């Protein structure tokens, strides 16, 4: 599951479906440690990187 | 989740792109109208010149 | 989810997103129309020169 090369593992929606020209609105990451670190990385990317949005 | 985030962006950016397409269409229509007006003005100038020659 | 405020994305995904195309649309509708008017004037001038 980590570093998965099978795109079928990710659902069709929430995967840049109907991507906007100025906003891909999708990104995939596999952070180490707990998911709280991933949220902090998302929180770090929540400013000056993209307008606030949620993904699974 | 993103039911009012990227989802609402998918309508805001959609409206922005629709406005871009409408602006392009309006520019093309204005180009056609300006060309028609220029042709009418050129025809009027030619008619005036022909009338001047006939008067001479 | 992630550490962030609640309901703070009511305009960050609109003001800095839709304007990125609205400004381009306005600039096109202005500049292309002006250039088309100038080109029509030039074509009228050439046709008037031929008529002259």
From Swiss-Prot, chain B:
The modification N-acetylserine is found at residue 1. It is found in: Vacuole membrane. Subunit of the V1 complex of vacuolar(H+)-ATPase (V-ATPase), a multisubunit enzyme composed of a peripheral complex (V1) that hydrolyzes ATP and a membrane integral complex (V0) that translocates protons. V-ATPase is responsible for acidifying and maintaining the pH of intracellular compartments. Belongs to the V-ATPase G subunit family. V-ATPase is a heteromultimeric enzyme composed of a peripheral catalytic V1 complex (components A to H) attached to an integral membrane V0 proton pore complex (components: a, c, c', c'', d, e, f and VOA1). Present with 2280 molecules/cell in log phase SD medium. This is V-type proton ATPase subunit G. The lineage of its organism: Eukaryota, Fungi, Dikarya, Ascomycota, Saccharomycotina. The gene is VMA10. The chain holds residues 2 to 57 of 114 of the full protein.
């Amino acid at each position: 599951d980590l570093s998965v090369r099978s795109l079928h593992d990710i659902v069709k929606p929430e995967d840049f479906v109907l991507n906007s020209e100025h906003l891909t609105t999708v990104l995939v990451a596999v952070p180490k440690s707990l998911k709280s670190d991933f949220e902090k990385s998302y929180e770090t990317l929540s400013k000056n990187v993209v307008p606030a949005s949620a993904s699974v | 989740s993103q039911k009012n985030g990227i989802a609402t962006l998918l309508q805001a950016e959609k409206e922005a792109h629709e406005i871009v397409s409408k602006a392009r269409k309006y520019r093309q229509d204005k180009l056609k109208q300006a060309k028609t007006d220029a042709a009418k003005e050129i025809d009027s100038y030619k008619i005036q010149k022909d009338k001047e020659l006939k008067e001479f | 989810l992630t550490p962030n405020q609640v309901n703070d994305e009511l305009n960050k995904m609109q003001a800095f997103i839709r304007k990125e195309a609205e400004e381009k649309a306005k600039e096109i509708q202005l500049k292309a129309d002006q250039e088309y008017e100038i080109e029509k004037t030039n074509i009228v001038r050439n046709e008037t020169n031929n008529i002259d």
